[PDB]
Design an enzyme around this catalytic site. Sequence first.
Site, PDB file in Angstrom:
ATOM      1  N   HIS A  41      48.806  79.607  37.035  1.00 51.09           N
ATOM      2  CA  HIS A  41      49.097  80.896  36.433  1.00 51.09           C
ATOM      3  C   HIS A  41      50.082  80.852  35.278  1.00 51.09           C
ATOM      4  CE1 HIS A  41      51.877  81.088  40.023  1.00 51.09           C
ATOM      5  NE2 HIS A  41      52.710  81.620  39.139  1.00 51.09           N
ATOM      6  N   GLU A  72      44.861  76.122  42.402  1.00 47.08           N
ATOM      7  CA  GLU A  72      46.013  76.693  41.708  1.00 47.08           C
ATOM      8  C   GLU A  72      46.855  75.661  40.938  1.00 47.08           C
ATOM      9  OE1 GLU A  72      45.980  79.772  41.288  1.00 47.08           O
ATOM     10  OE2 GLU A  72      47.859  79.912  40.152  1.00 47.08           O
ATOM     11  N   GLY A 146      60.230  83.232  39.089  1.00 45.29           N
ATOM     12  CA  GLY A 146      60.844  82.270  38.173  1.00 45.29           C
ATOM     13  C   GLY A 146      60.925  80.887  38.788  1.00 45.29           C
ATOM     14  N   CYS A 148      58.146  79.379  40.088  1.00 44.92           N
ATOM     15  CA  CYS A 148      56.779  78.855  40.075  1.00 44.92           C
ATOM     16  C   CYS A 148      56.797  77.517  39.379  1.00 44.92           C
ATOM     17  CB  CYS A 148      55.765  79.817  39.421  1.00 44.92           C
ATOM     18  SG  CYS A 148      55.539  81.426  40.296  1.00 44.92           S
TER      19      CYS A 148
END
Length: 181
Positions: A41, A72, A146, A148
Amino acid sequence: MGPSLDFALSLLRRNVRQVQTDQGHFTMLGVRDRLAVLPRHSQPGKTIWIEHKLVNILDAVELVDEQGVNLELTLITLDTNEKFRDITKFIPENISTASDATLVINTEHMPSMFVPVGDVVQYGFLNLSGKPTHRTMMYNFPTKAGQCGGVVTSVGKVIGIHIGGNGRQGFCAGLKRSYFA
């Protein structure tokens, strides 16, 4: 200095980079050579800000299941002089849980940050995008925004990349050595 601190501080020195994309600030893991991994993402474009410099992205691969389900993780190949220390030996051959893991975060807003997330246990399927995501693991720790891309480590092993949370729990995309062969 004990071995867990040294191992984690070495990761920050050599493999764990502060990065920025259009989507915001992320922690990036350099795995070997010019290959790094980010949370999907982060949506890296054609270039990416790495710490002090805009770096060109030569190739980006959004990892999926044998059934085409999202894992992901985005593998990026960088146009870099730097060759990352090879850390594929510290990544298990299969997705591994762990006891008492530390989440290692490295971002401009959260530099060199160490979060004890506790035990990391098998979770499997997750709703993130929301699109189906497989091979996730979970820690019972209220992880913030924040974080990730933060690196899940325990006892010399690098087992996951943080991909989000629900206010009460945090979730990582499991790592396995074969993603980086």
